[PDB]
Design an enzyme around this catalytic site. Structure first.
Site, short mmCIF file in Angstrom:
data_model
loop_
_atom_site.label_atom_id
_atom_site.label_comp_id
_atom_site.label_asym_id
_atom_site.label_seq_id
_atom_site.Cartn_x
_atom_site.Cartn_y
_atom_site.Cartn_z
N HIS A 1 0.41 -0.63 0.03
CA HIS A 1 0.47 -0.13 0.17
C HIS A 1 0.64 1.18 -0.22
O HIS A 1 2.04 1.00 0.48
CB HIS A 1 -0.77 0.28 1.00
N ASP B 1 -5.47 -7.49 4.76
CA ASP B 1 -7.09 -8.07 4.30
C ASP B 1 -7.25 -9.71 4.01
O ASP B 1 -7.79 -9.81 3.78
CB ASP B 1 -6.73 -7.77 3.17
#
Lengths: 371, 370, 371, 131
Positions: free
Chosen positions: C256, C310
Site C-alpha cells: 500500500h 485483508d
C-alpha cells in the site's frame, strides 16, 4: 500542518517567576505558597522576591524606605504642563498620557537599573491622585512621606488620611491583585521588552494594553449589577429571568479554576470580618441576601462569584471613584510588569514568526481610466 | 502555502464539451452559438452535439426516432412494486429510488459500445416515464399507456396531465428546456467528476447525479411564491421599505456571474410577451407585468433584474405546473449533461485522491475509563 | 498558473477528527493513540466520544443502550415491500436503493432531537435491515432479531441462527475497531459535498453510498481472498511468485502506497490470527496461508510489500463463515460512522463550497441546418 | 375484545399480537392489547366497572334495538345498528370532554379563578351533572 489558531497553545519558554497549580489551588508566589506568604508580610519583601528574587534584610529595607521618600515628589512645571490638558475625557487615556512623559524628565546601564526603577515605583500614585484632583478642579496636595505609602495615597487622592487596618486590608487586596498568570500585559511585554530599549515605554505600553476589552472589564458590570440590585425581594423573578437569559451569571463563574480558587474565599472571610467591624448598613444586608439567593441555585454548577463582587463592595465602603478601579488594578499590573521587563531583556533575540499568506497573486493594476 | 477557500478556481481540466463567453454573453454550445443554435433546432440534434458531438444526418435521426419510440415503455412489474410506496413527502427520493432499479433491469457492465449506446438510449428514454408516473402515482390517479404516437414532449405532457399537449407550447417548452439544458459546470457536474472518471456504471452515475440535483433546501419556487403572493402590487412603497430594511438582493432578481443580464432572460421576456399576446390577457399576468415594470423602475441602476425564473413560474402557472414539478423539470432539462460528462470523464482514466491538511490535536492521552 | 492534473494534493481545511501521518505510523484518534484507547476501548463509547465529542456518563451510556434496544424494531409494510424487490444480482445496487426507506418512514423533521434522534435510529435499525438482504437473497424466510442477546450476539443469532462464545464476539469488536476510522477519503469528500448544502443526514448517506461504489463497485479484500484461494497449492507458490513477477504488477494484498511501515494494526491482526488458529487449531487454509506467506517473504525481501490486514480478515471471516462478498458491507458499517462524525463537524461549517475550473473548446461559430 | 385490540394495534401499524386461550378474560384482554401480563386487582376493578357499565336507563341503544327487533332479520344487523347509533353526541361524548377538562385543569393552585370563571359560565359543572 498543525497550528493552534490564535496563539492557542504555543509555549514560550521555562518561565522563571513563580509557580501555580490549579487542581489543588497551588499558588506558590516565587515558589512560596500565597496563603503561607500571606501571613504577616509587607509589600517591600514581596516586590523584592518578584523582581530581585532574594529575601532581604532590614538594612536595604530601611535604605529603600528612606530613598523612596527622597524621590516621592513630582515636578511643578509638570503640573503646569498638565494644566494645559482638557477635562472631559476618560481617565484611562489620561493616565496613559500622564505616564507618556516620564522619559522627558529622566532621559538617558548598571546604574540605570535601579534609578528609574525606584523613581517609577514611587511616582505613579502621585500622577493618579493628581489626575483625580485635576479632572474637576480641586487643588493639589503636597507629597508626603510621613505617612505610609497607602496612607499617603489615601490622603492625596481623598484629602483624608486612611486607617491602619484598612491600609492592611488594601495591601492584602493588592497582594491578591499583585499578579495573575502570564497576562496580556505580560504578553505585550514579551512582544516588546525583548528589544531592551527602556523600562519607560515598556511600562507605558503595559498600562495602555491594561485597558479592558472595549475600555472596560468585569468589575464595572459587576458593580453595576450590584447597584442595580437595590430592593431584595425581586431577586427570584430576576433570577428566573436571567435563567432564561442564558448568560454568565453576574457575580458567579469564571474560566480559570473549577474549584473556586481560595483568593475569593479569603476575600469573603475578610468581607465578613469587615462588615462585622463597621456599621452593617442596608447595602451589606442587600448584598448578603443577594449572595445567599445566588448561592442557593449555582451550587450544582460550581460557578463562584468573581472577586470583583467583593472588590466593588470594599471600594464602595471606602468610596472609591468609578473610573479608579482601572488604575487601581494597573498599579499591581505594572508591579508585575516590573519583573516582566527585568527578566525580559535578559533574553536577547528578535522574534519574527511566519504567517499563512492567503492573498491572491498574478494580478496587475490597470490605470484609473480603466480602474 | 496558499489555498483559496471553497476550492476557488481549480482548473483541473480544460473542458472541451462546451464554450461560453460571459462578457458579451456568447454561449457556444460545444461551439454552437446561443441564438444561432436556438433559431430552428430540434432536441435530437442538440443532444447529439452535447454527447456524441457530431452533426446528425437524416438517416440516424430517423433511426433514433424509431428506436427510442420502441423502448419508450415502462415495466408492468415496475408499475406493480411501486404501489407499495407511501404517499406523503416530496417526490425527490421517490424518483431517486425509481431510477435506482435500473440495475435490477440491466446488468450490461460494458461490448463497451453496447452499454454506451444501447443502455444509454434506454436510460435516456426512461426517465420521463417514471416522472409522469410519479405525477400520476403520488396523487393516486390511474396510469396512462406509454404512447409514441405523439411527440416526446407532447406525449409526456399528455400523460402527466391526462390532457393532450399543444405544438406551439411544446416548441416553447423545448426552447426553455434547451436554455435550461445547460448551465456552467454544476455541482451535479462536480459529483460527476467525483464519480464518472472512475466509470463504475452510467446508470448509477446518473442516479447519484439526479439524487444530488436537489440544491439548498431544494429557491425559484420561493421566487414564484413571492410573485403569486404579490398579486395586487399597489404597495410598492412598503415593498421598497422592506427591501431597504432587508439589505439583501431580491432573490430571482440578480445573480453572481452574469453582470450584463445574460440574453437568455431577454429571449424569455420576448417569448413571454408573445405568449401573453397570443393566449389572451390574464389579469393576474397583467398585475405581474405591472409589478415587474415597477421593479425595473428601481433596479435599473443596480444592474440586477428579475431573473428568468419569474417568467418560468409564469409559464408554469399559465400551463398549470404542480409545485414539485419545476424541480423535476429542472432535473429533466439538463441531466443529459452528466451523459456528456461520463463520456468525457470516462474518456479520462485516473484515480481521484482525497488530500488535505488536518490541524486537529496532535498528541494526547486516551485514558482507560477516565 | 492554476493547472494541477487530477486535483491531487491540495489541502482544504483544518480537520478536527482524523490525524493521518504516513511517516511515523502514529495513530491520533482526534489526537489519541489508537492502541492506547484500544487496550480498554468499547465501540459504543468510541462512537460516544466520536460524535458526542467526549467521554459520556455511565447512566448516559446505559440510557443510550436502552434507547437503541427499544428502537431496534423494523416495519411490517417494509418487509412486504422487501419481497417486491428483484432477485438477480449482488447487494450493491440493493443497498443503494434500500437506503431510501426513511423518506417513507421517519423523515419530516428538519432541533434538540433532530440531531440526537435520527442518528440513534439509524444505529438501532440498519443492522437487521442490511442482514435481511442476504437472509432473503436465496428465498429464505427471515426471523426477528433477538431480545436478550448483545449487539453482535443478536447479529449472530440472526445471520446464522446460532450463538458462539463471547471470545469471538470480542474479536469481532476488535475487528470493527480496526477498520473503524479512515483517513481523507473521496467517500468523505463526497460526504462533505452533499452535506455542504445542509440537506439532511439520511439523504446525505444515500448519495454517499450511491457514490461509494468503486470502478464497477465491488471490494478489495474480497479480491485478496479470491487470489489467495486461486493460489491453490502452497508449495508451488514460488514458481507462481516468479510468474506473477513477470507481469510487473503489485503483489496482491501487499504494497500500500500510504501505509508502508508495517502498521501495528496489521501486526495485531497477525498476532490475533495466530491466537485463533491456535485455539481452534490450524486448518488446510491456515497451513497453506503460512506456507504462502513464508514463500513470499523469503522471495522478495526488497519491496516491503507485506501481508496486509485483508488476507487475515478474509481468513477470520472464513473462521466465522459468512459470504465472502459481504466485505463492502462491513467496510461501510465502519466508514459511515466516521462519515456521520464528519457530518456533525461540517454542520457548523456554513462555508458553501463552490469550486471553479477551465475549458478550452472552440466558439463563435454559427448554426447551419441540413448538415 | 379481540377485534378491539386488533383495530387498536392496526392503527399502530405493527404486526399482530396473537392472543392466548390460557389467560383470564380481563387478563387476556390486558395481555393481547398490551403484550404484558397484568396483576389481579386492576382486573377485578375493571370487572366491577364493567358491572357499573352493565345497566342504565332506557337507552337509545335499547330503543333502536327493540325497533329493529320487529324486523326479525338477524342479531348481526341488530348489533350493527346498535354500534351505529351508539356513537357519542355528534361524534362527541361526555367522557371525552370530561377527560379534556381534566387535562384542562392544568395547574391546581388557581382553582378558585377557574371556579369563578365557570360560575360565570354557569355550565353544568365540569365533571358534575346528569339528566
Amino acid at each position: 500542518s498543525e497550528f493552534r489558531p490564535g496563539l492557542e497553545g504555543v509555549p514560550a519558554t521555562l518561565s522563571s517567576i513563580s509557580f501555580v497549580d490549579g487542581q489543588r489551588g497551588v499558588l506558590e508566589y516565587r515558589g512560596i505558597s500565597i496563603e503561607q506568604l500571606a501571613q504577616q508580610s509587607s509589600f517591600l519583601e514581596t516586590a523584592y522576591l518578584l523582581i530581585w528574587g532574594h529575601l532581604p534584610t532590614q538594612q536595604e529595607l530601611t535604605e529603600f524606605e528612606h530613598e523612596i521618600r527622597y524621590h516621592r515628589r513630582i515636578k511643578f512645571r509638570i503640573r503646569d504642563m498638565m494644566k494645559c490638558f482638557p477635562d472631559s475625557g476618560h481617565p484611562m487615556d489620561a493616565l496613559q498620557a500622564s505616564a507618556a512623559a516620564l522619559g522627558l524628565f529622566y532621559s538617558r546601564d548598571p546604574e540605570y537599573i535601579r534609578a528609574a526603577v525606584v523613581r517609577l515605583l514611587a511616582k505613579i500614585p502621585t500622577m493618579v491622585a493628581a489626575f483625580q484632583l485635576i479632572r474637576k478642579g480641586n487643588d493639589p496636595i503636597q507629597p508626603r512621606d510621613e505617612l505610609d505609602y497607602a496612607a499617603n495615597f489615601l490622603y492625596m487622592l481623598t484629602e483624608r488620611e486612611p486607617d491602619p487596618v484598612a491600609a492592611r486590608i488594601f495591601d492584602i487586596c493588592l497582594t491578591l491583585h499583585a499578579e495573575h498568570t502570564i497576562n496580556a500585559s505580560t504578553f505585550s511585554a514579551m512582544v516588546t521588552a525583548s528589544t531592551l530599549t527602556d523600562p519607560y515605554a515598556v511600562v507605558a505600553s503595559a498600562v495602555g494594553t491594561l485597558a479592558g476589552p472595549l475600555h472596560g472589564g468585569a468589575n464595572e458590570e459587576v458593580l453595576d449589577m450590584l447597584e442595580a440590585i437595590g430592593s431584595v425581594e425581586n431577586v427570584e423573578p430576576y433570577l428566573d429571568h436571567c435563567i432564561a437569559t442564558k448568560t454568565r451569571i453576574m457575580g458567579f463563574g469564571h474560566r480559570v479554576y473549577k474549584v473556586k480558587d481560595p483568593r475569593a474565599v479569603i476575600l469573603q472571610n475578610l468581607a465578613e470580618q469587615l462588615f462585622d467591624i463597621f456599621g452593617h448598613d442596608p447595602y451589606y444586608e442587600i448584598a448578603v441576601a443577594v449572595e445567599k439567593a445566588a448561592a442557593e441555585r449555582l451550587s450544582h454548577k460550581g460557578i463562584y462569584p468573581n472577586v470583583d463582587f467583593y472588590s466593588g463592595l470594599v471600594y464602595r465602603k471606602l468610596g472609591i471613584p468609578s473610573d479608579l478601579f482601572t488604575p487601581v488594578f494597573a498599579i499591581a499590573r505594572v508591579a508585575g510588569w516590573l519583573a516582566h521587563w527585568k527578566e525580559q531583556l535578559n533574553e536577547n533575540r528578535i522574534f519574527r514568526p511566519t504567517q499563512i499568506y492567503t492573498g491572491s497573486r498574478n494580478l496587475d493594476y490597470t490605470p484609473i481610466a480603466d480602474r
